[PDB]
Design a protein around this motif. Structure first.
Motif, short mmCIF file in Angstrom:
data_model
loop_
_atom_site.label_atom_id
_atom_site.label_comp_id
_atom_site.label_asym_id
_atom_site.label_seq_id
_atom_site.Cartn_x
_atom_site.Cartn_y
_atom_site.Cartn_z
N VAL A 40 34.88 8.86 4.44
CA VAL A 40 33.44 8.97 4.73
C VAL A 40 33.03 8.33 6.05
CG1 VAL A 40 31.15 8.45 3.87
CG2 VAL A 40 32.89 9.31 2.29
N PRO A 41 33.52 7.15 6.43
CA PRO A 41 33.13 6.60 7.73
C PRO A 41 33.59 7.43 8.91
CG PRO A 41 34.16 4.93 6.36
CD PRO A 41 34.43 6.23 5.71
N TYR A 42 34.64 8.23 8.74
CA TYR A 42 35.24 8.97 9.84
C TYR A 42 34.74 10.40 9.96
CZ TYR A 42 38.78 5.24 9.74
OH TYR A 42 39.45 4.03 9.73
N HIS A 95 35.63 16.96 -10.53
CA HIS A 95 36.38 17.16 -11.77
C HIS A 95 37.87 16.89 -11.66
CE1 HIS A 95 36.08 21.08 -9.67
NE2 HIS A 95 37.31 21.28 -10.09
N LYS A 96 38.34 16.29 -10.58
CA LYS A 96 39.77 16.01 -10.50
C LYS A 96 40.07 14.54 -10.81
CE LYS A 96 40.66 19.82 -7.40
NZ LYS A 96 39.30 20.35 -7.13
N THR A 97 40.52 13.76 -9.83
CA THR A 97 40.72 12.34 -10.09
C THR A 97 39.41 11.59 -10.30
OG1 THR A 97 40.89 11.92 -7.69
CG2 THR A 97 42.97 12.15 -8.96
N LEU A 98 38.26 12.17 -9.95
CA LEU A 98 36.99 11.55 -10.29
C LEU A 98 36.65 11.70 -11.76
CD1 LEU A 98 34.00 12.08 -7.86
CD2 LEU A 98 34.85 9.96 -8.82
N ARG A 99 37.37 12.56 -12.48
CA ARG A 99 37.23 12.72 -13.93
C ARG A 99 35.80 13.04 -14.35
NH1 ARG A 99 40.10 8.09 -17.25
NH2 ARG A 99 38.15 7.05 -16.64
N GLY A 100 35.14 13.93 -13.61
CA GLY A 100 33.80 14.35 -13.97
C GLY A 100 33.73 15.79 -14.40
N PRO A 101 32.52 16.31 -14.57
CA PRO A 101 32.35 17.75 -14.85
C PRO A 101 32.77 18.57 -13.64
CG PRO A 101 30.25 16.83 -14.21
CD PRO A 101 31.23 15.66 -14.26
N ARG A 102 32.92 19.88 -13.84
CA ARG A 102 33.31 20.77 -12.75
C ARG A 102 32.11 21.03 -11.84
NH1 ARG A 102 38.14 22.43 -14.56
NH2 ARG A 102 38.35 23.52 -12.54
N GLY A 103 32.29 20.76 -10.56
CA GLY A 103 31.20 20.90 -9.61
C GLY A 103 31.60 20.29 -8.29
N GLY A 104 30.69 20.44 -7.32
CA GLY A 104 30.93 19.99 -5.96
C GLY A 104 29.94 18.92 -5.54
N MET A 105 30.21 18.34 -4.37
CA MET A 105 29.33 17.34 -3.78
C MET A 105 29.59 17.27 -2.28
SD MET A 105 28.63 13.44 -4.93
CE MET A 105 30.31 12.87 -4.72
N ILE A 106 28.56 16.93 -1.52
CA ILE A 106 28.66 16.83 -0.07
C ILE A 106 28.11 15.47 0.35
CG2 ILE A 106 28.10 17.92 2.16
CD1 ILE A 106 27.54 20.49 0.72
N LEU A 107 28.89 14.73 1.14
CA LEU A 107 28.53 13.41 1.64
C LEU A 107 28.41 13.43 3.15
CD1 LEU A 107 31.04 11.30 -0.44
CD2 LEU A 107 28.72 11.93 -1.10
N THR A 108 27.50 12.61 3.68
CA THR A 108 27.42 12.44 5.13
C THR A 108 26.71 11.13 5.43
OG1 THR A 108 26.82 13.50 7.23
CG2 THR A 108 25.20 13.62 5.44
N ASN A 109 26.92 10.63 6.64
CA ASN A 109 26.16 9.49 7.11
C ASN A 109 25.14 9.86 8.17
OD1 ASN A 109 27.28 7.45 5.49
ND2 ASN A 109 29.09 7.41 6.82
N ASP A 110 25.15 11.09 8.66
CA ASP A 110 24.27 11.52 9.74
C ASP A 110 23.03 12.16 9.11
OD1 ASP A 110 22.95 13.10 11.72
OD2 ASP A 110 24.83 13.71 12.65
#
Ligand SMILES: CN1c2c(O)nc(N)nc2NC[C@@H]1CNc1ccc(C(=O)N[C@@H](CCC(=O)O)C(=O)O)cc1
Ligand SMILES: CN1c2c(O)nc(N)nc2NC[C@@H]1CNc1ccc(C(=O)N[C@@H](CCC(=O)O)C(=O)O)cc1
Ligand SMILES: CN1c2c(O)nc(N)nc2NC[C@@H]1CNc1ccc(C(=O)N[C@@H](CCC(=O)O)C(=O)O)cc1
Ligand SMILES: Cc1ncc(COP(=O)(O)O)c(CNCC(=O)O)c1O
Ligand SMILES: Cc1ncc(COP(=O)(O)O)c(CNCC(=O)O)c1O
Lengths: 412, 411
Positions: free
Chosen positions: A213-215, A224-239
């Motif tokens: 994330v910092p880079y 839903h993989k190693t985060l062990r959550g429901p099936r779905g997506g997410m988008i992160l940013t710092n800008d």
């Protein structure tokens, strides 16, 4: 049990799948077993709410409490990963990546992404996918000898092709990815950097894999993989400027109403991942994966791509057993071990045969396996693949699976 | 108990449950799914990666997920008469995204319904992928009747020569003549796509003309009048399109499907095959027509086109001196949930609008009959006319309470 009488065929199928998960060893690297809370959230009345827009700014009345749920997911996401902005509405990892490209590049732009055979995802530039169809993808792979990313080759490609965007991240790469080095290459050629951490997102959250994330200009992930959550997506940013583009890209750009009951499951899983127990789970994931890699390395005929793992998965070249990935998959299935066939670097067969299988530990780690048990799984895998239709040998493998599945009940 | 680990989340879910219980849900695109649908969505099927299609997956262990998905496909085919069905779209927007990929090319000319006139965002809005990716020409409704003028549609199709005509609507209360659309598309050599998301339950019940025999591709959501989980679906009768649809969905624009959601789709389709569903669907339209009559006679509320043939209505609130957003907020304060909505020839922004949209699928699901629909409409009128008389508003609240106590939902 009342409604199960109205639709016997369907509830019978669901019951079988519950037994299947109970009595097989689930070794698909991208799978996991979510908590009862995650399932309860997905099975909740939030499926009934239309909530186009974003918390506080909806196109519908009555979103007071859906706004609490979605802000719960956003805030916990920002806390898990250190992002200043989070979008939790993508229906899947593919929708997340679709919107990320919309916020970063224009159609036809040049993107440098990991080749699928080497370990990249479909959405990292495959020509049967929107990514390869919409943008001009240049692919980087792994070195033929070490089968890890050669960052000099990435730099060479970046200088040659002058991409607008470099994508890092992988569906079938067992090694640490140097996001700092990727950022450095992106800076040298003036490109943006997008990191798709879908497979390793849980390990990143536990601090066991370098955090992108910092880079990265934008970081995408599945839940839903190693985060062990429901099936779905997410988008992160710092800008903040990208955050505006991401939100507009997701909605009304490429999606309509969000799946608020699934977003509830995301909020559930993010809080589980913020718990200190989650970090112990994540170290167990890597400890178990390394244990199996050691068994596979000693066996002739299971060749671990790059010879090692730093994370949750391993890619196994099965060619020297005289089989392809599709048959290796079905052999292991007949003894109740579930893998997927998988392309290996420099794959020569079709994506439906392939030369290998992929194995990951998150699901067995979740059901409680420790390294001793991981070692027994790998030994069982090696035994089944070397069996060559010696049915006595195969039945012993079934027995060992049965011992392992009984030692670690899952849904019982 | 797991609720104690996350009290903030579970409190919010509990509040939303009371909200659905004690408010009147009049959002035309919402419904209340069965206990079976929620149980299916809340099942272990969420743990399965199932890229591909039944029998031809990229993962092991799909034997039972394949049964579930084929249940959903087969029931879709029996409900709508389609020869082929794709039940993997995550949403109606994903469904339409794949449909366009299977039908046209980037930049091609598409003729679709204008958003203000009633079309959906994905029917060519320029803030949406549809308007950005393709050249959309919009048809609307006649200004005087506020219904579709099919001769104007033919003129546009002849003038602009679209590769594709899209029919279907998010906020159109009148019957759509899919046969006429097919005829226009044929004259200009275009393909025809129908997005029946809102009326799919009515179509299934035989209460709205069925587009599947006419459209090259029919798309839909499963969660409006079909009363299923949230998701999309793509129907066709052409074997070549079915193959293009399947490749477009995956590996075109999605990855793994949501198999627990597809389970809920299978649940809901069988519910719609039951004869009670047809009675539910008839009650939807009866309740909607009942409310339209109240709104027509009330001073200050104008029904767009003056009638409804389906589940919804657009109410022009301008004579009350308010806009749709204010109407939305007024009604919410008395526990009536609507959404602001553009009306044909909308002059205000989509965040203010000149009207509200009201639909009956959800109150019909709680059991309302025409008498009760009439009371809802009377309460909506009373609240919008209350105009800072807080006493009147409290009476509206009381009437909402009588209705929600008479027709319990989650209790
Ligand atoms: C998730 N995904 C995946 C991935 O994206 N990247 C890697 N490295 N490994 C994997 N492993 C599992 C899974 C494989 N998914 C795939 C991989 C490849 C394709 C693909 O190229 N299919 C083509 C041709 C298929 C064929 O020839 O059989 C198509 O037209 O559908 C379609 C789906
Ligand atoms: C689903 N949707 C909808 C629709 O698609 N079509 C109709 N006729 N009616 C409705 N009613 C409810 C809902 C409204 N959704 C909308 C309607 C309009 C827009 C839209 O034009 N948004 C613009 C800016 C709008 C503004 O000026 O505030 C954007 O850049 O996001 C965005 C979403
Ligand atoms: C009611 N009216 C109407 C309106 O007044 N305003 C709008 N925006 N839209 C509409 N839509 C429906 C209706 C008008 N529809 C039309 C559509 C086409 C024509 C038209 O081209 N007629 C020409 C003849 C054209 C020819 O044959 O060459 C004429 O001289 O009458 C005339 C009227
Ligand atoms: C890195 C990466 N990014 C995006 C996706 C797509 O997520 P959805 O399937 O939710 O669209 C995947 C799926 N990877 C699946 C696997 O490795 O088996 C992935 O590995
Ligand atoms: C005709 C139509 N098509 C597609 C969609 C999009 O479905 P998703 O929201 O699942 O992406 C909608 C949503 N209509 C929402 C409403 O009328 O309130 C729709 O009305």
């Amino acid at each position: 049990v009342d409604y199960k009488t109205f639709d016997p065929d369907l509830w019978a199928a669901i019951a079988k799948e519950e037994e299947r998960q109970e009595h097989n060893l689930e070794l698909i690297a991208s799978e996991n077993f979510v908590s009862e809370a995650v399932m309860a959230a997905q099975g909740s009345i939030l499926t009934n709410k239309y909530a186009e827009g974003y918390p506080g700014h909806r196109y519908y009345g009555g979103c007071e409490f859906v706004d609490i749920v979605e802000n719960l997911a956003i805030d916990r996401a920002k806390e898990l990963f250190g992002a200043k902005f989070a979008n939790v509405q993508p229906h899947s990892g593919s929708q997340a990546n679709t919107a990320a490209y919309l916020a970063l590049v224009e159609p036809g732009d040049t993107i440098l992404g990991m080749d699928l055979s080497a370990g990249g995802h479909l959405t990292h530039g495959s020509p049967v996918n929107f990514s390869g169809k919409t943008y001009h993808f240049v692919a980087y792979g792994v070195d033929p000898t070490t089968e890890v990313i050669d960052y000099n080759v990435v730099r060479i490609l970046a200088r040659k092709h002058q991409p607008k965007l470099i994508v890092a991240g992988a569906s079938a790469y067992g090694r640490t990815i140097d996001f700092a080095k990727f950022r450095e290459i992106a800076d040298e050629v003036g490109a943006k950097l997008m990191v798709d951490m879908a497979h390793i997102a849980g390990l990143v959250a536990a601090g066991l894999h370098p955090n992108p994330v910092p880079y990265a200009d934008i970081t995408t992930t599945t839940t839903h993989k190693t985060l062990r959550g429901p099936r779905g997506g997410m988008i992160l940013t710092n800008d903040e400027a990208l955050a505006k583009k991401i939100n507009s890209a997701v909605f009304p750009g490429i999606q309509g109403g969000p799946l608020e009951h699934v977003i509830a499951g995301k909020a559930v899983a993010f809080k589980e991942a913020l718990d200190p127990a989650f970090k112990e789970y994540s170290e167990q994931i890597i400890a178990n994966a390394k244990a199996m890699v050691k068994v596979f390395n000693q066996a002739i005929g299971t060749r671990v791509i790059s010879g090692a793992t730093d994370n949750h998965l391993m890619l196994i070249d099965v060619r020297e057993l005289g089989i392809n990935g599709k048959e290796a998959e079905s052999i292991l299935d007949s003894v109740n071990i579930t893998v997927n066939k998988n392309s290996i670097p420099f794959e020569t067969l079709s994506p439906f045969k392939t030369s290998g299988i992929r194995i990951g530990t998150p699901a067995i780690t979740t059901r409680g396996f420790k390294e001793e048990d991981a070692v027994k799984v790998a030994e069982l895998v090696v035994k089944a693949l070397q069996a060559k239709d010696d049915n006595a040998q195969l039945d012993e493998v079934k027995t060992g699976v049965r011992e392992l599945t009984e030692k670690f009940p899952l849904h019982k």
